[model samples]
Every structure is written in structure tokens, then in C-alpha cells.
Target chain A: MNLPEHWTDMNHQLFCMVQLEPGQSEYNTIKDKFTRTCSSYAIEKIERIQNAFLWQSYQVKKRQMDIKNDHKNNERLLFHGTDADSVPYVNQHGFNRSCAGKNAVSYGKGTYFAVDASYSAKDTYSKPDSNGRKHMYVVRVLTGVFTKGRAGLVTPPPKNPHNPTDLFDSVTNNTRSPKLFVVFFDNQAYPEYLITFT
Target chain B: NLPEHWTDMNHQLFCMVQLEPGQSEYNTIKDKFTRTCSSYAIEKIERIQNAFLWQSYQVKKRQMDIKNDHKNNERLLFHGTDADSVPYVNQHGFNRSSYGKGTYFAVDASYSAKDTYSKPDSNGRKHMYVVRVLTGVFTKGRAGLVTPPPKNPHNPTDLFDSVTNNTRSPKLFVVFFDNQAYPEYLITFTA
Candidate 1:
């Protein structure tokens, strides 16, 4: 009748702690199927376990490459305010919208730009120092580019907001090389484009 | 309750004796019973039974020895001669040798087949035996009596030539015989 508090997730679903009894037919039925199904499920997971590790390591390597390439010399002058006379800024929060005029830069999906790069210390990314040290921030070209349909921001008038499903299906299905754009920013919040790599 | 000799005599004479025509079947049964019911028959059966037991024991022991003493038995089969005379015929249907003769001692089958010994000659008959000056025979100084006339006069010179070239001793001489492995003459070569 009673089970441990740690009993949760698939374990609890397969073997119902509260519903099973010693002599009941329901308990016997659940126990047999629970054991058999759990064993087979465990075996299937083992087959994919190695591939999961390989995918994780690959993601880590990509992140490391991005960090190594973040630098001042590679900054693109076009996205920085120095070229503001030619390329005007547009404020469309989550959507990929064009800025203005014929030659205006369009903030498309999959855009990456460096937000802050003047911070010399690594901890400056999480917590700003009271001593007026510069911080760094990098955003992939656009927020929802890699994770479009996988995740998104929601705005509500009051009652119900957006809940997206199958957010990761597109990125995982696409076999093309992922695109990355890096941007850097200093303590003044002025942004500069660093680099882009496919 | 019959005496032992009396019952034995009845058995010994049972086949030799004849009965009267009026004798009853009871008398015949009695006579047969007395013949079988004797100390002699019992002793005779016991002797036969003991003979079987002893013979079986002997055969089992021999077989065990053959199994356990394999290496030694093989050596004996290859090299040991029969202490008593053994008679065997050659391929030509002749009595090769009376094996234990004082003059012509039989060698083991392995030794007889050696390259140094009996081998086919030009006539297809093989040499019967190999004669050698066994170790210490010459030192005893009686090699003269065993020596005989040379069948091949050049044999001694050829042997010397080989020994001189190889710095070795020519110890044995092979003498050819008829197909029966019987030597007709004692041939020797002198250098």
C-alpha cells in the first residue's frame, strides 16, 4: 500500500505504488507487465545510450569553437553603431523583420551578434561587478532561429498565453550545417558584430 | 550314507554296466543318483572349476602386464629373442634357421631388418645375417677361430679405404644367403 517517496517518473507510472496489494489480481497483473516492460525498455535505452553521449560531446565542441573565435578584430562594422548612418535599427522583439530603406540590414532568423565582450573576467557574464567592469554577451543571429517551433516567448493580454509543442523537431530533423553569428557588447551596452561561421 | 569309494566305483562303471530286463525304473533312478552323488565327481568338478579360475587369473595378469609394461614389452618384442628354439619359414617356403642353434643365434626382428644386416642382393635373395667383432671379442685374442675365408677378396681393401677416408671403424660384415636366411658358408674378409 505504501511506497518510498523517491518512487517517481516512469517507475511510478509502470508500478503504481498506491493501487497494488499482495493478493489482488490487479496487483499481479501490473507486477508481471511492469517487470517485463521495464526490462525491455531498459534494453532499448541502452542501444541509444552511446549515441546520446556522442551528440552531447559534439554540442560541447561547437560551443567551445564559438568561444575561441569571439574577438575584437573579427567584429563586423556594419552591425555596430558606427554604420548607423547607413543601416538603421529596427525593434521587432521576437520576429525577424526588416529595418528600413533599400539597403537596411534585415534581422533574419539564425542571426548571431556579440552583445558584450569587454568583460575581462569570466564571472562577469553572470554577475556584474560594482567596480564598473565591462561585460560580454553573444546572441545567435536570431533568438528563435535554431529553436524555432522548439521554443518561443509568449505575450498575454491576461487569460491564456502561447504554449508551443514540437519545438525541437525542426532543428533535429535538419541535416544542414548550423549557422552561427556572434555579437559583442561593452559596459555601455553598445553592440558590435564579431563573426559568422557555418 | 554311502562310502566314498563305493559311489566313485559306481560312476566309473556306470557306462560299462548293464541292467536286467525286469529292473524297475526306480532301480535305474537309484543307480543314476548313486553315480552322481559321489566324492569323486565332486572333487573332479572342483578341480575343473579351480582350473578355470586359475587360468582366468593367469590370462588377466598377462593382459594387465601387457598394458602396464608397454614400453618394456615393445623393447622385448623388437629386440629379445626366444630363449627356446623358434622355427619360422622364409618367403621361399624354406626352414630359415633353427633359431637357438649354438652356431647361428637368432637375432631380434628389429636387428634383422637393420640396414647393416639382411638386405636383398643382386639375385633378389637377402643376406641372412651380419657378423661383427662384438666389443672385446678381438681383445680376448680368439677372433682367429671365428674368422673364415673371404667371399670377396676386395672387400677388406674397400672397407679399409672407407675407414681411412672417414676415420671410422668397419665393424660388421653382411653375408648373403639363400632366400631361407640360411647361411651356406661362414665368409670373412681379411685386410
Candidate 2:
């Protein structure tokens, strides 16, 4: 379990991080997904982390979300750009709601996940630090029962159009064909893999 | 004799480092207090420093570090309480939660300074505190919440560290853990 030195023993024990070896099936698959839009960037590493704690949290939240969305989780493999300094933290703690406005919350003030990989490869999205090393995450997002999102939304609007208390599972830039999805709850998105590139 | 910061009490769990007007520490805290609470005039400011309480805070800090969590979400928040309960709060900690099961703190000083919290005492002095709160992994608060909700429905053990009025940009943060916060500075107002 290779993580930050400051990470707790429990965190290390829970997160089983294994880097994908080149020429392997998993590595080739991740590489294929990353380079599909990030053609200009060179992939330096791909670490697949199976964190039980985060998965359990997701499982817990997914049950009700599935029920609310008519028993369909609508899980998708999505991309999220993150800073190099924050890569270790996000990998260890899972995604947090604290990072609401770091990126363009054009849809809402929640953690934004891109449906398109190239959209997240932009410098504005995946900001490079002084070393010019850019980092991104292959996130597994559950885009259940979503709706058209707007700026300043604290969470997804109520699923009921008139009743206005039962909230939708998530939100998006456009419901018909979304390019970005937003989630407020921390347990909704699973940070599956780390993509550190130049 | 008591490390220069302590007062008359010896071995006391509570120590108030009084910040005299014109002093550097006083000026710094006063400046911060005036940022949000602009209309009020400050009467006094005292720094709370207790070794035992500080240890609890350090432990929590290390725990957050281990998980690479919270990520320095520690901010100076506002708490308005009764003047009579001030000493008890300094010694033990906060009690009473109308918003949730945990203690309530306002992100803006102005919110806590309102008539609802900062009520005037017999001497016409209002009490407020600038508290150091560790608002880690928080969710939107719900009324009558006994404990901050779990991270997921699969397990109750993995609970969120705190709750807030807004998950995105919060105005109030609630912490169930006693040691998750420290009443850093006590300030009295004349308004």
C-alpha cells in the first residue's frame, strides 16, 4: 500500500494500491482510456487503488440512490482533474465536498466530473504545478436520475417537480446529452485510479 | 510560574491569556473580529490555552493527516453563548444543540453576534468566542440529527466528522466530537 507517509495505518490497511505494470491488460485498458483525449500528454504512471472504506461508503449511498432512480445506478467511468499536491489526499480520503469551487462550478457548487476525458485534460481543469506534472483521476461516478444544473446550486434539486423536497440523485450541464456531471455527497463518486501525466 | 500564560489557577484545565488593548496579540485578534462584526466595539479578548485540551486537538489533527482528510479545513468560527456558561465552556466545552446533536458554530462572525445567540448579560455585555473548528468531511445538516450521518448506508461506524448548513459553501458547521474544536479566543462586545 504505497501512499503518503502521513496516511494513517488504517488508511494504508484499507487502501490496497497497486500500480499497473506496462503491457498488462489493466494498464493497456487504462492507457487506452486516458490517451483517447489526453493525446498531447505522456502517461507516467497509473495506480489502481481498491479502497474498501470508500467502496463501502459508495455502496451504502448507492442503495437508496438506486431505489430513487428506479433501481438503476447508471454508473459511468468518468474523468476528474486534480492538482498533484491534492492527488495523494484525494486518493487516500476519497472525494470530499470541500473542493466545491476549485474548478468551474458552472453547473453547481459541487464536485464536477467530466463525461469526456479531453475536457478534463485542459490546463484549467488539470492544473500543472511548478514541476509541470499534471494529475487526473479515473473516477467511477453514479449519475442516477439527473437534471439540467445551474450555477449556485448547493445540491441537486428535488426530484418532484412540485413537491420540492425529494432531491434528484445528481445534476448535469445538460440532461439530454451531458458533458459534465455534479455530485454533492462525498460517497457518490469512487476515485478508482490515479493518472499522473505531463 | 505557570509558563507565563496561566493565571492564578494552578493545574487548571482552563487558562485564559488575557489580551490587553494595544498589545500585538490583542490587535491581531481585534482586527479579525472587526472584519465581519464591524458595528460592534470590542471590550476584551482572552486566549484560551489548556495543555490537556491542546493534546486532544493534536491527536485529531494527526488522525486527519493520516487519512489525508479534512485538508486544513480548520477555520476560526464564531460561537455565541451565555456569559455565565463561559467558564464552563472554557473548562469542559459546548453544550446544547438546536440545529443538530452537536455544537453549533457560525462561519461568519455576524451570524453568531445576532440577538438569538449573543444576548446581553446583566452588565449589558454580550459574549462571543472565536473558536478553532476542524470542519472535516461535512454534509448538509438536518434538524433533530442526533449524530452526523454515516458516510454511507452500508456502515454506521464510518461517520462524517461534521455537518453544515450548506455542503457546498457552508455558513454553519456542526461537530459531534468534543475535541474537534477549541474555544481559542473569548471576546466581549458592548453593542
- Candidate 2's residue-wise lDDT over A131-171, tens digit each? 88888899989888889888767668876666443577789
Give one digit per residue, the lDDT tens place, for model 2 in B1-191: 12354455665545677787978878888888788888998888888876545655655565665565537657788999878778667754564325577788988888899877887899889989988887777788887765678788565446777888877788988986546787888998987
Give the winner by DockQ: 2
Task: Name the runs in model 2 displaced over 4 angstroms.
Answer: A1-12, A102-105, B1-173, B176-191
In the order shown, the candidates' DockQ scores are 0.00, 0.03
Please provide, for model 1 over B1-191, each residue's C-alpha lDDT reduced to its tens digit, 9 standing for 90 to 100. Answer: 22222224332311112233244632443333234222211100000111111222233233323333332211111111221111111111121111111122222333433434334344333322222111111111112222222224454211110011111432222211111122111111111
Worst 10 residues of 1 chain B by lDDT: B40-49
lDDT of 1 by residue, A1-198 (tens): 122233334342212212224365634443343233233221111000111111222233234234434432222211211121211111101111112111122222222232222211123122323542222212222112222111122210111124221121112112253322221111111221111110
Give TM-score values for chain A, per-prediction.
0.17, 0.87
TM-score of every prediction relative to native? 0.12, 0.52
The fnat scores of all predictions, in order, read 0.00, 0.00
